[PDB]
Amino acid sequence: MQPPYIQERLKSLNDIETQLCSMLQEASQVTFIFGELKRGNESVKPQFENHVKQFYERLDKSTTQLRKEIQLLDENVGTRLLPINVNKKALGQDTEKMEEQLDLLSAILDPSKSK
Amino acid sequence: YQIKKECALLISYGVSIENENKVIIELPNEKFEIELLSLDLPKINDKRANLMLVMLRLLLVVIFKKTLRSRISSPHGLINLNVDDDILIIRPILGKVRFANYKLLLKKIIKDYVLDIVPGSSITETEVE
Amino acid sequence: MVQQLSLFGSIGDDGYDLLISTLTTISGNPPLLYNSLCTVWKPNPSYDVENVNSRNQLVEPNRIKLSKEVPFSYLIDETMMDKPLNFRILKSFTNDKIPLNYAMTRNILWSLQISDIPAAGNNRSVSMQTIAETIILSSAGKNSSVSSLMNGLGYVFEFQYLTIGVKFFMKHGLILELQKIWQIEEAGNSQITSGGFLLKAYINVSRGTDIDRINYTETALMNLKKELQGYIELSVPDRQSMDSRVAHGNILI
Amino acid sequence: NLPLNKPRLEKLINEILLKSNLSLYNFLHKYVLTLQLYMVHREFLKLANGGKFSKSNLIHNYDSKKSTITVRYWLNGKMDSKGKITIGIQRTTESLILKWDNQSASRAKNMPVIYNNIVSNIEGILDEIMFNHARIIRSELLARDIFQEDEENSDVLLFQLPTTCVSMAPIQLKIDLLSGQFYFRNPTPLLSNYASKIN
Amino acid sequence: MSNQALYEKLEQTRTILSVKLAELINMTTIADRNDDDEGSFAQENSELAVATTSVMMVNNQTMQLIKNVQDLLILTRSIKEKWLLNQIPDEKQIEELLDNCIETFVAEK
Amino acid sequence: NKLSSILQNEHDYWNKIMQSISNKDVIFKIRDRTSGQKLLAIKYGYEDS
């Protein structure tokens, strides 16, 4: 599985597009409410301020968090996930495919474990 | 593929290739057939065949490790495998089997011509590294 | 005798570990540790070489390099046997002090090597240098020693230094070296490449007359340089810095 | 099922018929023969990569201008012969035929030199030619009366050699069906050296 | 590179804000304004041309909002794809094992 | 409404992709010979081994 850092980076990105979807939905409801506000029933007038404020605050902080994600693309070059060289796997495929084969021989060698 | 290229040089000792997927090895008392087949009662020698497959895979892995070590050792050396030297897969198994056969034959010869003729002879068997 | 085609550069130790990761990503091979010890010898000034044809300049005096490999048991102090012997030990080699001191090297006293200034002209994209090399296998006699041998030829000791670094082998015979250099004197040991690593990528050509091979070598070197664009800048050094004749004194370090 | 260029063929045939005085049939036959030769060459190319004859056993050269294929086999054979095969259009029947260009095959009786249905059984034809050449060489050796005849195996030659002062034993020599070098069953170093000398 | 993406998202956000304010003012004063004072500037001089300009505003705001949101989503996916791709990162027992294996084969052969 | 329905559909496929993929081996984008688009590819072969 992928190392820790990438998992929360993808979680944050997923939160970003879910917030964008919520912003689009709230745009839909505010467009809906403005229609009847123009039709001239004043009951839903208080809800308009709340919808506008929530729409703007959803638009702002989403873009703000996407700013942090692009800073993290620039800043994580060779960083947090530090290098490692303990045999490199493109070569070391020869080594796991050594080990497991001998393991099979052991299973073949002992007739009491073949059950 | 490696088995094919290796056994193409063992015709003179009783090894033949039947088709693109079959190779046959003959011994004065035994026959071995190696086949590449598409998917489309426990016998005595089933474990023998499984062991043969296992050591063939091990020898291929050893060949790969030798290649990687030679490559890392020096850059100039062109990595072109020699069939007479590098490819050693059927050679060890065939050598072990035929050496055992010849050891049995010489044991029989010595017993017939020395042990049965000259009593009291003492025989000691050793291996030298 | 070879034509060596080379490109040079340097890096700060801060990026060192990230550089090593990237090389491994390109070549597919890991670093291999190595070391060496070079001694430079110069013609004896006590002897007047009137044979230098002053009116014709048939030849000019030059300096000889003798190199040898030294086991790591002389370079590892009592604090370092716990770590395994691999590339990571270079991270601890940042101090001007080193276990190998003047007395041990004096106790030591191979590959003999001579070179010339690179080829002139401004239409050369890589440093092309000519090297003449031989090997000393053993010796005997009442004064069998490197110092006595070089004094017999007519040369005397000038200085010495110690190189420690890592090697990368890529395709087509290309060799990439990351080095750290320690000059050694009785006064002490000083790291000239202070706070950094010297990078050198080079290829060897056995015959200078073959020009198809030389063109291929230059193509490979320029392709390698164009691969590392943005990370490290590989450049042709100064032609007047790689001159090792006795008349004029300077040393690329 | 071949993707024929139907409209280009329509205009070509219409132009030929308009300029015709026969010619269309000749062009069709020539195109059919050329396509058959090309697909035979393609089959050779496919087989040579992974075939039993890959290691210098068979070399094929194809000429479109003369529309003929020359096949050379057994490059390491100097027994007063060179294995050559010519595939080309027969003048009398206007058909592609395969001829084994060999004087030994020329005077050989009850043995066909020209074969048809190359596409279907090219491998069988090659095997038959191989076996016939080996049999001709073996029969020549028997006629020289150097090797005695082996009743059990028709492809094995018996050479009489004294292993000891009184022993007089036969040794089995066999012919490689691929490249054609004589070999012993269990050759000694001297036996292997002289087999190589024979080769 | 990433700075160019930063700038592009900047005009993306400011364009959202500007077109939002534009559609807000257009729909709020969609009720045409008649004021006798010369200071006011609202002209409706041709009858059905007014509705044409209205549907103009509608189509413009729709296309621009949808395009900007879709561009932002594609940018986020590109950022994630860059996150995934570009981030570059006993013997003796074997001896008796092989000895037993070879002796077993020799006995069984 | 259309945008919300479609968009949540591609988040459904997106989450399926995200939670269906493990790590596994060396990965890149390649252009298909027949399609010409970019697709994910994994190098599994012993060529480097």
Short mmCIF file of C-alpha atoms in Angstrom, two decimals, chain D:
data_model
loop_
_atom_site.label_atom_id
_atom_site.label_comp_id
_atom_site.label_asym_id
_atom_site.label_seq_id
_atom_site.Cartn_x
_atom_site.Cartn_y
_atom_site.Cartn_z
CA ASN D 1 -11.68 -12.63 -46.69
CA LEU D 2 -8.75 -10.60 -47.96
CA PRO D 3 -9.41 -6.81 -48.04
CA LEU D 4 -9.40 -6.45 -51.82
CA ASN D 5 -9.45 -2.94 -53.28
CA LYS D 6 -12.74 -3.45 -55.10
CA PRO D 7 -13.10 -0.01 -56.78
CA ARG D 8 -9.46 0.25 -57.87
CA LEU D 9 -9.79 -3.27 -59.24
CA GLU D 10 -12.95 -2.18 -61.08
CA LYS D 11 -11.22 0.73 -62.82
CA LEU D 12 -8.09 -1.34 -63.52
CA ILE D 13 -10.05 -4.18 -65.14
CA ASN D 14 -12.23 -1.74 -67.09
CA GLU D 15 -9.13 0.05 -68.41
CA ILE D 16 -7.48 -3.27 -69.33
CA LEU D 17 -10.61 -4.45 -71.16
CA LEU D 18 -10.91 -1.12 -72.98
CA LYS D 19 -7.26 -1.38 -74.05
CA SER D 20 -7.54 -5.14 -74.65
CA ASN D 21 -7.24 -6.37 -78.23
CA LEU D 22 -6.67 -12.63 -72.24
CA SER D 23 -4.49 -9.86 -70.80
CA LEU D 24 -6.77 -9.60 -67.76
CA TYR D 25 -6.46 -13.34 -67.12
CA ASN D 26 -2.68 -13.17 -67.46
CA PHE D 27 -2.49 -10.27 -65.01
CA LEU D 28 -4.77 -12.09 -62.56
CA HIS D 29 -2.64 -15.24 -62.75
CA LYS D 30 0.55 -13.23 -62.28
CA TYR D 31 -0.92 -11.43 -59.26
CA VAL D 32 -2.10 -14.72 -57.74
CA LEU D 33 1.35 -16.27 -58.19
CA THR D 34 3.02 -13.18 -56.72
CA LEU D 35 0.69 -13.20 -53.71
CA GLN D 36 1.31 -16.92 -53.14
CA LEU D 37 5.08 -16.37 -53.34
CA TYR D 38 4.87 -13.42 -50.95
CA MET D 39 2.84 -15.36 -48.39
CA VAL D 40 5.25 -18.30 -48.71
CA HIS D 41 8.10 -15.88 -47.96
CA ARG D 42 6.10 -14.51 -45.02
CA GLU D 43 5.64 -18.05 -43.70
CA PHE D 44 9.40 -18.59 -44.04
CA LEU D 45 10.02 -15.38 -42.10
CA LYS D 46 7.61 -16.44 -39.35
CA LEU D 47 9.15 -19.91 -39.08
CA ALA D 48 12.82 -18.85 -39.20
CA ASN D 49 12.56 -16.83 -35.97
CA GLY D 50 11.56 -19.84 -33.85
CA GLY D 51 12.07 -22.79 -36.18
CA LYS D 52 14.32 -25.81 -35.78
CA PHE D 53 16.43 -24.48 -38.68
CA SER D 54 17.08 -21.03 -37.19
CA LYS D 55 20.78 -21.56 -36.39
CA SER D 56 22.16 -21.03 -39.91
CA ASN D 57 20.49 -24.19 -41.23
CA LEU D 58 18.32 -22.43 -43.83
CA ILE D 59 18.77 -19.14 -45.69
CA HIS D 60 16.14 -17.82 -48.11
CA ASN D 61 16.52 -14.98 -50.62
CA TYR D 62 13.48 -13.69 -52.52
CA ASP D 63 13.52 -11.73 -55.79
CA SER D 64 10.33 -9.97 -56.86
CA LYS D 65 11.60 -8.95 -60.31
CA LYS D 66 12.29 -12.58 -61.21
CA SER D 67 9.70 -13.73 -58.62
CA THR D 68 11.91 -16.58 -57.43
CA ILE D 69 13.14 -17.82 -54.06
CA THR D 70 16.59 -19.36 -53.57
CA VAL D 71 17.04 -21.50 -50.45
CA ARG D 72 20.49 -22.58 -49.27
CA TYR D 73 20.83 -25.23 -46.57
CA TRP D 74 23.71 -26.99 -44.80
CA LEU D 75 26.26 -24.20 -45.13
CA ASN D 76 28.83 -26.36 -43.32
CA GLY D 77 28.68 -29.13 -45.92
CA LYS D 78 31.58 -29.78 -48.29
CA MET D 79 30.83 -33.35 -49.43
CA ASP D 80 31.15 -32.34 -53.10
CA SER D 81 27.69 -30.78 -52.94
CA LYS D 82 25.81 -27.64 -51.89
CA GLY D 83 22.20 -27.87 -50.76
CA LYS D 84 20.21 -25.57 -53.03
CA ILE D 85 16.47 -25.24 -53.69
CA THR D 86 14.75 -22.99 -56.24
CA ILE D 87 11.07 -22.01 -55.97
CA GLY D 88 9.75 -20.40 -59.13
CA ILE D 89 7.11 -20.30 -61.83
CA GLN D 90 7.11 -23.32 -64.14
CA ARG D 91 7.05 -22.33 -67.81
CA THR D 92 4.94 -25.27 -69.00
CA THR D 93 2.19 -25.23 -66.36
CA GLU D 94 2.42 -21.53 -65.35
CA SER D 95 2.49 -22.73 -61.72
CA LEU D 96 4.85 -22.19 -58.81
CA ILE D 97 7.04 -25.26 -58.26
CA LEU D 98 9.92 -26.21 -55.97
CA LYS D 99 13.02 -27.86 -57.45
CA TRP D 100 15.87 -29.37 -55.42
CA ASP D 101 18.85 -28.29 -57.54
CA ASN D 102 21.23 -31.21 -57.01
CA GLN D 103 22.96 -33.51 -59.47
CA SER D 104 22.72 -36.29 -56.88
CA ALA D 105 18.97 -35.70 -56.85
CA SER D 106 19.14 -35.40 -60.65
CA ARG D 107 20.33 -38.95 -61.32
CA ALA D 108 18.52 -40.41 -58.29
CA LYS D 109 15.78 -42.85 -59.30
CA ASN D 110 12.25 -43.31 -57.91
CA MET D 111 12.66 -40.01 -56.06
CA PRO D 112 10.74 -36.85 -57.04
CA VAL D 113 12.74 -33.64 -57.34
CA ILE D 114 9.80 -31.31 -58.06
CA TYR D 115 7.01 -30.86 -55.50
CA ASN D 116 3.73 -28.93 -55.36
CA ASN D 117 1.37 -27.85 -52.57
CA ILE D 118 4.25 -25.96 -50.97
CA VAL D 119 1.93 -23.81 -48.84
CA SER D 120 0.24 -26.76 -47.14
CA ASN D 121 3.26 -28.96 -46.39
CA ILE D 122 6.44 -26.90 -46.78
CA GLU D 123 7.74 -28.45 -43.55
CA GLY D 124 6.97 -31.95 -44.82
CA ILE D 125 8.69 -31.23 -48.14
CA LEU D 126 11.76 -29.91 -46.32
CA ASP D 127 11.84 -32.99 -44.07
CA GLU D 128 11.53 -35.28 -47.09
CA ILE D 129 14.38 -33.47 -48.86
CA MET D 130 16.51 -33.69 -45.71
CA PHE D 131 15.89 -37.42 -45.33
CA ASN D 132 16.49 -38.06 -49.04
CA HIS D 133 19.82 -36.21 -49.00
CA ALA D 134 20.90 -38.11 -45.88
CA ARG D 135 19.87 -41.41 -47.48
CA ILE D 136 21.76 -40.58 -50.69
CA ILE D 137 24.93 -39.80 -48.72
CA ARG D 138 24.52 -42.97 -46.65
CA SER D 139 23.98 -45.07 -49.79
CA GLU D 140 27.13 -43.60 -51.34
CA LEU D 141 29.07 -44.51 -48.19
CA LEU D 142 27.68 -48.06 -48.29
CA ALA D 143 28.58 -48.33 -51.98
CA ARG D 144 32.14 -47.36 -51.08
CA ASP D 145 31.89 -50.27 -48.57
CA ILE D 146 33.51 -48.37 -45.70
CA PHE D 147 30.57 -48.62 -43.28
CA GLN D 148 28.60 -51.83 -42.90
CA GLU D 149 24.80 -51.81 -42.99
CA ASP D 150 22.80 -51.60 -39.77
CA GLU D 151 19.72 -53.82 -39.96
CA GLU D 152 18.06 -52.43 -36.82
CA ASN D 153 18.35 -48.77 -37.87
CA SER D 154 18.37 -47.54 -41.47
CA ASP D 155 19.82 -44.14 -40.47
CA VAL D 156 22.71 -45.50 -38.35
CA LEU D 157 26.06 -46.48 -39.85
CA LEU D 158 28.28 -49.15 -38.29
CA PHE D 159 32.05 -48.64 -38.37
CA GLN D 160 34.23 -51.61 -37.42
CA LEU D 161 37.01 -50.73 -34.97
CA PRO D 162 39.17 -52.95 -32.72
CA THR D 163 38.89 -51.73 -29.13
CA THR D 164 41.57 -54.18 -27.98
CA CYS D 165 43.95 -56.64 -29.64
CA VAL D 166 41.30 -59.36 -30.03
CA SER D 167 38.08 -57.34 -29.78
CA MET D 168 36.51 -56.18 -33.06
CA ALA D 169 33.47 -54.05 -32.35
CA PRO D 170 31.10 -51.75 -34.25
CA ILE D 171 30.55 -48.08 -33.47
CA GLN D 172 27.30 -46.31 -34.35
CA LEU D 173 27.60 -43.08 -36.33
CA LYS D 174 24.49 -40.97 -36.90
CA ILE D 175 23.58 -38.09 -39.19
CA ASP D 176 22.11 -34.87 -37.83
CA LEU D 177 18.74 -34.25 -39.47
CA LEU D 178 19.13 -30.46 -39.13
CA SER D 179 22.69 -29.49 -40.12
CA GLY D 180 24.11 -32.82 -41.28
CA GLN D 181 27.29 -33.45 -39.26
CA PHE D 182 28.23 -37.02 -38.41
CA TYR D 183 28.34 -37.79 -34.69
CA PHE D 184 29.11 -40.73 -32.42
CA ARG D 185 26.89 -42.06 -29.65
CA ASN D 186 29.53 -41.84 -26.88
CA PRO D 187 32.55 -40.18 -28.50
CA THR D 188 35.93 -40.19 -26.80
CA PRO D 189 38.08 -37.04 -27.09
CA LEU D 190 39.97 -38.61 -30.00
CA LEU D 191 36.65 -39.83 -31.42
CA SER D 192 35.17 -36.34 -31.08
CA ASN D 193 38.25 -34.79 -32.70
CA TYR D 194 38.04 -37.14 -35.67
CA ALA D 195 34.28 -36.63 -35.94
CA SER D 196 34.98 -32.90 -36.22
CA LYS D 197 37.63 -33.72 -38.83
CA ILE D 198 35.01 -35.74 -40.72
CA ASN D 199 32.56 -32.83 -40.53
#
